[PDB]
């Protein structure tokens, strides 16, 4: 809960990245400028890190509040409070090592 | 920037050309890395508006506003409130009035 | 000797007569745009001041620049004779539509083709002008705006002197600073090194230059033949010949560049001689004229340097080097030589409100020009005009920036009349082209000993800028150049002359200036043979009553506008004298005002021309008045009407008012004033109210500068205030949809919204509580929107069928009072409104605040304080009469703050409201030689006035204090030494020891308690930093510094400090859970991880850093 | 006197047309009114001049 | 003058010291003051070239008056400041060790302190000078891995020379010194303080 004996840095790996994420970001398009919602994989799409709202999936199907740790397999997302959008992260895939 | 240059990578190697162009778009991508974990660290920091250096990743940390010293310049509280303060010669020491 | 018709009558102690009356306070604002716009009444000015050559403003930069041509000299164009045209509207409509206040100006253009021979000319529009008030204010949107003055240093020359250290010998630097160009330093080093530094380049020997324009080697040997230092480094030099000289010149300029003498001949003139490129302002070319005294005879027209300055220059310096006093050159009468001092108002010109805006315009014109010319030179030469080359949006781009963003641009302060009066003759020193905060010096923060007459010493804001902004002395008056004058009159051989002259800062150090005060007999002879006199720098001595040249005007000479009404100045201290000063600043306007007992005679004066007080301007008789307009038939016949606006929101948060103070059948004479604005009464300033003050410690309520008040003056609005708030809200389209305000709003009860009208907005005159709802309006619901295609669907159907949010405006913490008045503006209308709005309304709420605990008073001498506690009437001590009194006064402040100035008030202030009858039966006693013979018989509330530094002596009052007429019961309350004896409300008993009372004037400062009052429990949260919110109008709470912290951890208090930084600022789960064992009864959970901190780590391991937590 | 009622005005900082002073001068005025009540209950009083 | 007393620096006064105790042996220049001093069981002179602008101090005589002048030939005990002034820590601290400069620093705060006539309890500057004087410089590393030249705490550094000679292996050569509050702060153990 609150017991921290200890902090210790160590040097990540290509494989801790790929545990940490979520998701694969595969395009730089922001927030669309017409609908103002994420593109599909986008660089906020809630596939990858989560719903934009509070208990609501993309597609409407499980927006009912009586659904905690259910993804929607018609949008492929979860169903958390909003909060969890700020505390999961994403990785992207290099083609050459750097 | 990286995630757009990945994408170019990633489509001039499928479709296949020599080894100088190959090779040129693999320095762009470490050169968009280099300046995506810092920019200024080496080499002419990256400006897109009125000349300005931008605001890296690393530049959370150090600084005036890096997260580190934020945190101890101290945060706003609840349960508080200030006024004007008054003489009163009628309490005792331990007491105060409100 | 009341020069307005029909000011109150006040005698005062005079002693000595002021020759002329107080100058226009507002005359210096004013001059400058007038001499800019260019007027007829400017030219007769000018014309009677003897200036030969008249010279508007924008005649002046719009002639400078044309005539314009290209380079293949096939075409030019030329354009001058500015004028101007009529308003707009008035001034009550463009301040109330949101409008500003300007007018439009016509040049005429000529446009001539060279080639051809032709001529087109006509008028042409250029925009329009934010015009000036003639209260000197610029009204820009509706919000009033005011321009300071700046100091900058005059360009010139400048002799420096630098004591080496370690070598002990002169060096005598020379420095140039022309308004823009190339700088010149010309020093004389330990090596002989007389050298040039020109754009901070290597220090050069000044022959090579010398050569370099071709003089020759023998003017150079015989000229400075006298001189042996600079002979040496003549037969020093190695390069000789004007080619090899020119070259190595623009060698060391330009190097890299191919040297030819025609560039190095060609950049001389360029960078010396081209006017455009290089330029000085002709107060420049002026003072450099009269520091060397060549080309004095003749009025300066060409404003660029020339050489045979350059010489006269190096001559100077080599002269200056071999210590001679005074210098002389062919053509020019004999001067002095001496080093020149930043700090002297001699060189430290002002530039008022017309040289900014001439140089804002002026860069417009230059990037109009450069269009035009390019233009020009690109368009078709045949069907060309000037209307197609003109270009508008540069210089009314420019113009609207400068009023708008320009730290020279403030918002007119106007808690009352006396603080905008300050404001506006405010001299600032720092801002755009000036010196900043810590490149500043300290030094320049002192006083200089030509100060005197020119800038008040006393008046200075608190905080760090100190030094960096004063004020115009009264008689004060600005040089058509910029540089100060001070009145005097010139003794010409020990008889004074009645006639007055005005001197600048050279002109009055080369003279000598008498003492004021110094007695004078009637027939102008003076009676003492030997008279101080001050002389060149810090300097005063004793001198024969016949050398003596000049003499001041009034003892009030060097005293500020707002230091000039502080009675008995001459006793309180320049700390304490300059805190009362800033305070006078500061006061409320309350409801019902009270002209002072004892006052200096700039009351009225300052009130008149403070511009907030109305004034016929015909004599004429009024035929009806009422609470709302007045109207004065002239003797013409013809009727007039004024409008005074009542209870309108001032600039700073305050309320406006105007009362007549004229009856029905009065033939009102010309200049005499017919209503009162705030902070007046009977044409004249009234800031605060009379009080019966009682100085002695009182059971320690009024310990440490803590003040008692009696409730009499809070059961009588005696110090009641009026407060006016401001709100507004504003509907704005979206892409999602447009806002609009309705009487409707979702899910809220009947009750809640009784006060809207259909409209939406709250009845007029409907009380409001803090948290009530003010406007209602309606937010419109996001959903998926296609803009070809949902703009006509909505059209033909689908009409109101999404949802709406609630946005409404409520009042917000620690606001109520009455709803006055609301101003709602609409696009159906035709009002302008700013781009994507529709409809923004705002309203006006009034609360009324009487004098409550924790509020700050002051008098007039600063002596700052707050209310410690409010008793009863019933329980102040009281006079042996029954009188009670309504204040007291701590008494151990007064002696270490050494401000004993207050005391003589308030003994004059009680002698003055008793009235006083002196015994002239036997004949008038040897004190009250020196009184007015009108003077020694007063009714009670009487009124009296001290000019600073001639008022009553101590003797004065010693025999006045003997005398006051006793009370209607027959018998007199204080001695003679002032005190009294008291009755306690709480014992009953008399005190042991006599006490001193009187009447003292009182004002009320802004630093009100509603204020700052504010108490925070639980409310909105930030969403990005996840904080409450900050501010007392947001709800939020107060900060928490780490010095906090630090003293936390000096208890060894743990748990207090986790609360702190974890349960009440960031965790939100530790939030809700806290909250909800506080509204039961089950113990506070244990604080959890705060937000910083996962935070912290979800960014640390964006670098790669697997930052772990082992629990273990 | 505990509260006015004046017909045509709905607050007190406003003007009245026909009168040389505002709506808080005449409170003020009314303020120094002196009247003895011997009815235990809030009675009214009239003003009517023209 | 507290500023740069606690940051250590070079002081400005500079006043000579009494590197060794002897018979004064000073002769008085003018432009220079040259001052040199016979050791008294022997050995050779240190010599001082200050500057001659400044009026001489008392020389440490039975009476010990501050109205006495420098006398040449006199005696002087170690480690005194010839001429009014401030005598450089580090240099008291080589020849004295470190209680004398820790002593002479708090004499010399608690002096200036009471000059303005505020007064307070010398174990609040014991506890600050404890800290400012706890590192311990090495010349030479040896049979040690850190670099030479390289601070460490005198604990630290005790307890590797005490292994290393335990175990056979040479002792590392080190003596303690002195530096000011920043970098007294800069350096220390725990990494997410210093990153702060
Ligand atoms: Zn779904």
């Known amino acids: 809960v609150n017991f921290f004996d200890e902090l210790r840095i160590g040097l990540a790996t290509a494989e801790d990245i790929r545990q940490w994420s979520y998701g694969e970001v595969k395009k730089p398009e922001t927030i669309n400028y017409r609908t103002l919602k994420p593109e599909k994989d986008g660089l906020f799409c809630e596939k990858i890190f989560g719903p934009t709202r509070d208990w609501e999936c993309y597609c409407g199907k499980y927006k009912r509040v009586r659904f905690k740790g259910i993804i929607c397999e018609r949008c492929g997302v979860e169903v958390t409070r909003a909060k969890v959008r700020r505390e999961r992260m994403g990785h992207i895939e290099l083609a050459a090592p750097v | 920037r990286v995630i757009n240059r990945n994408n170019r990578l990633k489509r001039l190697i499928d479709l296949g050309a020599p080894e100088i162009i190959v090779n040129n778009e693999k320095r762009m991508l470490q050169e968009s890395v280099d300046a995506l974990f810092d920019n200024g660290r080496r080499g002419r920091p990256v400006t897109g508006p009125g000349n300005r250096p931008l605001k890296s990743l690393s530049d959370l940390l150090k600084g005036k506003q890096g997260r580190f010293r934020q945190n101890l310049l101290g945060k706003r509280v609840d349960y508080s409130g200030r006024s004007v303060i008054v003489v009163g010669p009628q309490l005792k020491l331990h007491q105060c009035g409100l | 000797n009341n020069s307005v018709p029909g000011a109150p009558n006040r005698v005062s102690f005079a002693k000595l007569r002021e020759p002329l009356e107080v100058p226009g306070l507002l005359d210096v604002q004013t001059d400058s745009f007038e001499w800019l716009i260019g007027s007829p009444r400017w030219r007769e000015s000018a014309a009677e001041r003897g200036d030969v050559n008249p010279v508007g403003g924008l005649e002046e930069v719009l002639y400078e620049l044309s005539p314009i041509e290209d380079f293949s000299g096939s075409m030019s164009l030329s354009f001058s004779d500015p004028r101007f045209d009529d308003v707009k509207a008035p001034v009550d409509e463009c301040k109330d539509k949101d409008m500003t206040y300007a007018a439009p100006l016509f040049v005429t253009a000529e446009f001539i083709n060279n080639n051809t021979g032709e001529i087109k000319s006509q008028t042409v529009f250029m925009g329009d002008f934010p015009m000036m008030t003639e209260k000197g204010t610029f009204i820009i949107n509706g919000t009033e705006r005011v321009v300071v003055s700046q100091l900058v240093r005059s360009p010139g020359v400048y002799f420096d002197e630098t004591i080496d250290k370690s070598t002990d010998k002169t060096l005598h630097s020379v420095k140039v600073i022309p308004s823009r160009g190339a700088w010149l330093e010309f020093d004389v080093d330990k090596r002989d090194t007389v050298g040039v530094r020109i754009d901070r380049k290597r220090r050069q020997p000044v022959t090579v230059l010398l050569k370099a324009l071709g003089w020759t080697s023998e003017q150079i040997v015989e000229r400075f033949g006298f001189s042996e230092i600079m002979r040496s480094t003549l037969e020093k030099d190695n390069t000789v010949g004007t080619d090899e000289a020119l070259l190595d010149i623009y060698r060391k300029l330009r190097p890299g560049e191919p040297p030819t003498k025609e560039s190095a001949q060609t950049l001389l003139e360029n960078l010396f001689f081209k006017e455009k490129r290089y330029d000085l302002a002709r107060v420049g070319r002026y003072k450099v004229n009269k520091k060397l005294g060549l080309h004095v005879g003749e009025p300066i027209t060409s404003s660029t340097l020339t050489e045979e300055d350059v010489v006269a ?175 005097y009159r010139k003794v010409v051989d020990g008889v004074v002359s009645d006639e007055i002259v005005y001197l600048t800062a050279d002109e009055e150090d080369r003279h000598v200036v008498a003492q004021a005060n110094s007695p004078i007999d009637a027939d102008g002879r003076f009676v003492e043979p030997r008279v101080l006199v001050r002389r060149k720098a810090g300097e005063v001595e004793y001198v024969p009553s016949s050398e003596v040249d000049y003499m001041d005007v009034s003892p009030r000479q060097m005293v500020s506008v707002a230091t000039a009404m502080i009675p008995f100045l001459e006793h309180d201290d320049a700390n304490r004298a300059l805190m009362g000063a800033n305070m006078q600043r500061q006061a409320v306007p ?523 | 006197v505990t509260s006015i009622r004046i017909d045509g005005v709905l607050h007190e900082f406003t003007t009245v047309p026909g009168v040389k002073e505002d709506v808080t001068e005449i409170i003020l005025n009314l303020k120094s009114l002196v009247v003895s009540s011997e009815e235990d209950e809030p009675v009214t009083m009239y003003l009517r001049k023209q | 003058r507290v500023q740069e007393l606690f940051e250590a620096r070079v002081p400005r006064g500079k006043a000579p010291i009494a590197d060794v105790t002897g018979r004064v042996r000073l002769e008085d220049g003018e432009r220079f003051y040259k001052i040199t001093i016979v050791p008294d069981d022997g050995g050779e002179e240190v010599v001082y070239d200050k500057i001659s602008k400044r009026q001489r101090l008392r020389v440490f005589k039975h009476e010990d008056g501050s109205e006495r002048v420098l006398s040449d030939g006199d005696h002087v005990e170690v480690g005194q400041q010839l001429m009014e002034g401030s005598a450089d820590p580090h240099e008291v601290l080589r020849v004295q060790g470190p209680r004398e400069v820790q002593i002479h620093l708090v004499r010399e705060v608690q002096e200036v302190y009471r000059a303005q006539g505020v007064s307070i309890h010398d174990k609040h500057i014991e506890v600050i000078v404890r800290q400012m004087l706890r590192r311990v410089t090495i010349i030479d590393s040896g049979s040690t891995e850190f670099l030479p030249g390289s601070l460490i705490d005198r604990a630290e550094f005790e307890a590797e020379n005490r292994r290393v000679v335990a175990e056979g292996g040479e002792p590392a050569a080190g003596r303690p010194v002195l530096m000011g509050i920043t970098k007294a702060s800069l350096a220390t153990d725990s990494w997410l303080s210093a990153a702060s």
Request: hydrophobic share 35%; with cysteine; net charge negative.
């Open chain 3, 590 to 1112: 309350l409801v019902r005002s009270e002209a002072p007992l004892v006052g200096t005679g700039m009351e009225l004066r300052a009130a008149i021309d403070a511009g907030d007080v109305v004034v016929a301007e015909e004599s004429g008789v009024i035929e009806e008045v009422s609470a709302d307009y007045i109207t004065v038939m002239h003797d013409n016949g013809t009727r007039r009407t004024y409008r005074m606006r009542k209870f309108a929101r001032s600039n700073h948060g305050t309320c406006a008012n105007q009362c007549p103070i004229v009856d029905a059948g009065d033939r009102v004479e010309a200049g005499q004033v017919i209503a009162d604005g705030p902070c007046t009464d009977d044409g004249e300033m009234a800031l605060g109210k009379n009080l019966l003050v009682a100085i002695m410690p009182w059971e320690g309520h009024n310990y440490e500068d803590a003040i008692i008040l009696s409730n009499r003056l809070v059961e009588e609005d005696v110090l009641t205030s009026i407060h006016i708030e401001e709100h507004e809200i504003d509907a704005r389209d979206t892409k999602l949809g447009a806002e609009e305000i309705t009487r409707d709003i979702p899910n809220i009860s009947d009750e809640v919204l009784a006060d809207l009208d259909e409209r939406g907005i709250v009845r007029i005159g409907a009380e409001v509580r803090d948290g009530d709802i003010l406007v209602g309006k309606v937010t419109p619901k996001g959903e998926t929107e296609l803009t070809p295609e949902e703009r006509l669907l909505r059209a033909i159907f689908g009409e109101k069928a999404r949802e709406v949010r609630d946005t409404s405006l409520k009042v917000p913490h620690g606001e109520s009072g009455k709803v006055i008045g609301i101003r709602v503006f609409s696009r159906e209308d035709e009002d302008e409104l700013p781009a994507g709005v529709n409809e923004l309304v705002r309203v006006y709420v009034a609360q009324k605040r009487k004098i409550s605990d924790g509020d700050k008073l002051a008098g007039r001498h600063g002596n700052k304080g707050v209310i410690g506690k409010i008793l009863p009437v019933e329980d102040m001590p009281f006079l042996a009469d029954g009188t009670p009194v309504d204040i007291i006064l701590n008494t151990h402040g007064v002696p270490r703050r050494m401000n004993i100035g207050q005391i003589l008030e308030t003994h004059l202030g009680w002698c003055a409201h008793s009235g006083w009858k002196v015994d002239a039966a036997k004949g008038v006693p040897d004190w009250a030689a020196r009184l007015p013979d009108e003077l020694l018989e007063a009714q009670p509330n009487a009124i009296v006035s001290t000019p600073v530094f001639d008022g009553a002596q101590e003797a004065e009052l010693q025999g006045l204090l003997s005398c006051t007429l006793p009370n209607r019961d027959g018998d007199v309350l204080v001695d003679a030494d002032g005190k009294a004896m008291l009755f306690d409300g709480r014992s009953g008993e008399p005190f042991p020891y006599p006490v001193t009372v009187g009447y003292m004037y009182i004002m009320k400062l802004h630093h009100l308690v509603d204020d700052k009052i504010h108490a925070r429990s639980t409310g909105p949260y930030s969403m990005i930093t996840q904080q409450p919110l900050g501010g007392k109008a947001q709800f939020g709470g107060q900060r928490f510094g780490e010095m906090e912290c630090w003293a936390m951890q000096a208890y060894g208090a743990a748990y207090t400090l986790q609360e702190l930084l974890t349960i009440k600022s960031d965790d939100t789960v530790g939030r809700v859970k806290v909250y909800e064992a506080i509204v039961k009864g089950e113990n506070i959970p244990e604080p959890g991880i705060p937000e910083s901190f996962k935070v912290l780590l979800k960014e640390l391991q964006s670098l790669c850093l697997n930052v772990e937590v082992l629990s273990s």
């Open chain 3, 313 to 487: 220059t190096i001559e100077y310096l080599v002269r200056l080097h071999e210590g001679q006093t005074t210098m002389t050159v062919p053509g020019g009468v004999e001067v002095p030589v001496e080093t020149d001092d930043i700090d002297h108002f001699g060189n430290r010109r002002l530039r008022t409100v017309g040289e900014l805006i001439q140089n804002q315009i002026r860069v417009g014109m230059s990037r109009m020009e450069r269009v035009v010319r390019e233009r020009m030179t690109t368009q078709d030469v045949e069907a060309i005009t000037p209307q197609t080359l003109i270009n508008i949006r540069p210089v009314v781009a420019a113009i609207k920036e400068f009023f708008g963003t320009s730290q020279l641009s403030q918002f007119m302060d106007q808690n009352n009349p006396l603080s905008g009066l300050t404001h506006k003759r405010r001299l600032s020193a720092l801002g755009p082209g000036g010196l900043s905060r810590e490149r500043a010096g300290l030094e320049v923060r002192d006083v200089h000993p030509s100060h005197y007459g020119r800038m008040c010493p006393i008046e200075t804001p608190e905080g760090p800028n100190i030094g960096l902004i004063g004020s115009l002395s009264v008689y004060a008056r600005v040089n058509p150049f910029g540089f100060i004058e001070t009145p």
